[PDB]
Structures are given as C-alpha cells and as structure tokens.
C-alpha cells in the first residue's frame, strides 16, 4: 500500500468500524473517524466508500497528502464518484498540483450525466476547465457546486476576487455547508482580506465544531493580522483536535513573536495542556 496506515489502530479489532467512523464524523471527531476508516481500508481495500470517507476526513483534518492517496484509491474503484473528484481538485489546488487539480475538476464535471455532453502551470487545461464550467453554468445557472468549482479553479490561478464572488454565491445557496464557508474563507484569506475570511470561518466552525482545517485557517488569518493571542488560541485548539510538527513549529513562531521564550521551550515536549491552560 502507498497509504501509511497508523500502526496499533484499535479499530482494527472492532466489529463494524465503517459504521463507527460514520458516527465519529457525525460527531465531528475527525482524527477518530480517520482511524476507523483506515481500519476498513486495511481489511477491505476494495471498499470504495471507505477510501472516500478516509480521504474526505483527512483533508478536513488538515492532511491533504493523506487525502490524495486515499482519494486516488476511491477514484480507481469508482471513477464516477463525483465527491472524490471534487475533493481531489481541492487538495491538489492546496498542494499546487495544477495539472492534477484541473484533471479532477474536469472529471468532476464530466462524470455527471447532466453535464457529460496566462495560467502558466497548465494554460490550455485551465482554459478548457473554465469553458466547461461556464458552459455548465449556462445549462444550470444556480448550481452551488458549479459556483464552488469555479471558486476552486479561480483559487488555482490566484484570481481571488472572481473566486470569492463565485463562492459567496455558493454559500448564499447553501449557508449550512461547512466546506463552502471554509472555501470562501481560505479564498478571502489568500486574497488579503483576512477579516472577512474570519467571519466565513466562524460560520464554518459553527456548523462543524471539529473542522480542524478551519481552526488552522483561523490561526493563519489571525497571524496574518498579527493578532497573536488569537492565533495562539486557535492553533492550540487545532493541534489538540488534530491528534503535527509543522503546527508545533508554527506555534513556536507565535510564541517567539509575542516575546514568550518560556513558552517556546515548552513546545518541544509537544504537550498541549500547559498551552491550553495558558491561553
């Protein structure tokens, strides 16, 4: 396997870890759900729903690398699972895999029977995607996933204003969708509008209190605005909820900038408790 399964996974022993993973997702316990889904992928690697759920969870748990590995299994097993193509496009965009991101969006659109009929990293592939999505928008004008998909595409080319407009329309249409609010927030954040981003993230966290990616993104935006007390608080939540070293290193920089050398030294132990108390 290309997937680095956690050793000593207690769900390996369980009757029905798939059910348990789904229930963990409903509860929003992402780390636990991922482990449960991992157990299913180990025991039954042909189970496409298992890889998809794993991939989906890992990306929300701020692990795009692990997400991609899992989603590619899902994509092999069911090339018409559009949730898999959608998530691959998102994680590849985050990872700046331009070609792979455009391949996923295109597959996302064309895998739907409904739809089946400059940018330096991948110029023509980009134009094609843009054209296909706009043509689809002509066939189905108020489709929130089409607007969201144009948001992903426009993030890829750093056209954060067009991305934000499309994604704002998507959340107007689906205001209880946690992923859409996070996507809008990330867009706004990357487009140097972190205050607005934080409002979107707050909506996302209210829907899914276990959305570790949103928590991380909030640490990022607060750090960008140099509100380090607020960044530190969100980052502690993120680290605690995630379970990593990259986040601890980011946390270390916050503690340094705020002139807390006593706390910086404590980050190597990687115990979140003194920091949970502190913040």
């Amino acid at each position: 396997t290309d997937y680095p399964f956690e050793a000593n996974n207690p769900y390996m022993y369980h009757e029905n870890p798939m059910e348990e993973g789904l229930s963990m997702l409903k509860l929003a316990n992402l780390a636990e759900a991922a482990l449960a889904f991992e157990a299913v992928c180990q025991a039954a690697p042909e189970r496409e729903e298992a890889w998809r759920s794993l991939g989906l969870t890992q990306a929300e748990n701020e692990k795009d690398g692990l997400a991609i590995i899992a989603l590619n299994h899902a994509r092999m097993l069911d090339p018409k699972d559009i949730a898999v193509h959608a998530a691959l496009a998102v994680s590849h965009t985050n990872e700046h895999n331009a070609n792979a991101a455009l391949a996923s969006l295109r597959a996302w659109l064309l895998s739907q029977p409904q739809y089946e009929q400059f940018f330096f990293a991948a110029p023509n592939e980009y134009r094609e995607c843009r054209t296909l999505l706009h043509a689809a928008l002509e066939m189905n004008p108020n489709d929130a996933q089409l607007h969201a998909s144009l948001g992903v595409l426009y993030n890829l080319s750093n056209n954060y204003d067009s991305a934000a407009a499309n994604l704002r329309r998507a959340v107007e249409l689906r205001p209880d969708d946690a992923q859409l609010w996070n996507k809008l927030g990330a867009t706004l954040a990357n487009g140097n509008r972190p205050q607005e981003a934080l409002d979107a993230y707050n909506r996302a966290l209210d829907i899914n209190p276990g959305y570790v990616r949103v928590m991380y993104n909030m640490a990022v935006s607060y750090s960008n605005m140099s509100q380090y007390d607020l960044a530190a608080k969100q980052l502690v939540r993120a680290i605690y909820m995630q379970v990593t070293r990259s986040m601890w290193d980011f946390f270390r920089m916050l503690l340094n900038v705020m002139n807390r050398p006593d706390l910086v030294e404590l980050t190597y132990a990687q115990n979140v408790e003194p920091f949970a108390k502190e913040f």
């Binding site: 701020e62 795009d64 998102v90 965009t93 985050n94 992903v152 993030n155 996070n182 996507k183 927030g185 990330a186 867009t187 954040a189 990357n190 981003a197 990616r213 991380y216 993104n217 990022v220 935006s221 750090s223 960008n224 980011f250």
Partner: peptide
C-alpha cells in the same frame, strides 16, 4: 503571509 487551505 501564510497560506490558507480550501
């Protein structure tokens, strides 16, 4: 400065 994630 820091990148945000979709």
């Amino acid at each position: 400065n820091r990148a945000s994630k979709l």
